[PDB]
Design a protein around this motif. Sequence first.
Motif, mmCIF file in Angstrom:
data_model
loop_
_atom_site.group_PDB
_atom_site.id
_atom_site.type_symbol
_atom_site.label_atom_id
_atom_site.label_comp_id
_atom_site.label_asym_id
_atom_site.label_seq_id
_atom_site.Cartn_x
_atom_site.Cartn_y
_atom_site.Cartn_z
ATOM 1 N N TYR B 1 6.499 68.748 10.914
ATOM 2 C CA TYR B 1 7.527 68.517 9.905
ATOM 3 C C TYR B 1 7.033 68.865 8.507
ATOM 4 O O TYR B 1 5.985 69.490 8.341
ATOM 5 N N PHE B 2 7.799 68.447 7.503
ATOM 6 C CA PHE B 2 7.480 68.696 6.107
ATOM 7 C C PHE B 2 7.612 67.402 5.317
ATOM 8 O O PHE B 2 8.362 66.498 5.695
ATOM 9 N N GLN B 3 6.871 67.324 4.215
ATOM 10 C CA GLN B 3 6.762 66.079 3.470
ATOM 11 C C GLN B 3 8.053 65.762 2.723
ATOM 12 O O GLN B 3 8.773 66.653 2.265
ATOM 13 N N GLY B 4 8.339 64.469 2.606
ATOM 14 C CA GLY B 4 9.484 63.988 1.861
ATOM 15 C C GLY B 4 9.096 63.599 0.446
ATOM 16 O O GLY B 4 7.977 63.159 0.192
ATOM 17 N N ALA B 5 10.044 63.769 -0.477
ATOM 18 C CA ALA B 5 9.773 63.507 -1.886
ATOM 19 C C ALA B 5 9.464 62.035 -2.126
ATOM 20 O O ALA B 5 8.374 61.678 -2.589
#
Lengths: 107, 113
Positions: B1-5
Amino acid sequence: STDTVTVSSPRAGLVMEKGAKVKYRGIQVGKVTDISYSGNQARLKLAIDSGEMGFIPSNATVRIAGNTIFGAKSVEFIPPKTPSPKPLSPNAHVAASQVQLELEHHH
Amino acid sequence: YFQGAMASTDTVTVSSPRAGLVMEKGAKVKYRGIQVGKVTDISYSGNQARLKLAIDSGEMGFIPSNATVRIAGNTIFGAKSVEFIPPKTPSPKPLSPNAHVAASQVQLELEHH
């Protein structure tokens, strides 16, 4: 087009699938649109065909089929007999046999 | 996945043993008196009922993995349809466009399989 008709419920605890059929002599005539919860009374917002109501007298009666179900309100985690050092991994799941359905107590 | 703000909360799911669980809106999640999350969605498949949750990621480092689930609530009526009945002596007047029918005329039968 539809005309809005309303119905008050004998039981305030009435939940209904939003937009369910409205029958009369076997044929659909409309749907329920909204459900209002004023105080400890429940009132239904109906909407049926603008011309179909000429076939329904003012002194008619209503039948509502359904079932007795459990209306949950909250969800709490419970510390166990012995607490595991491991926390909760995301996306994890707790099966049915670890779930307890409870009634709240009323003064 | 990708990081959340920011404010990135995770998910945990619950199987209800009794299919037929509906849930009130504003359903929050607690643990020893502290509100830690909320309930996202509910779904039904097969003959079971799923529940998806949303718990703050920081507060999950404190919930033990062997914690059981408590679910409060009250038994309510799960309606399905709305039917009409011709009265024994019907009124010639058709239904007024903005008519109300109190609890007196309403009847609440159970279902048959």
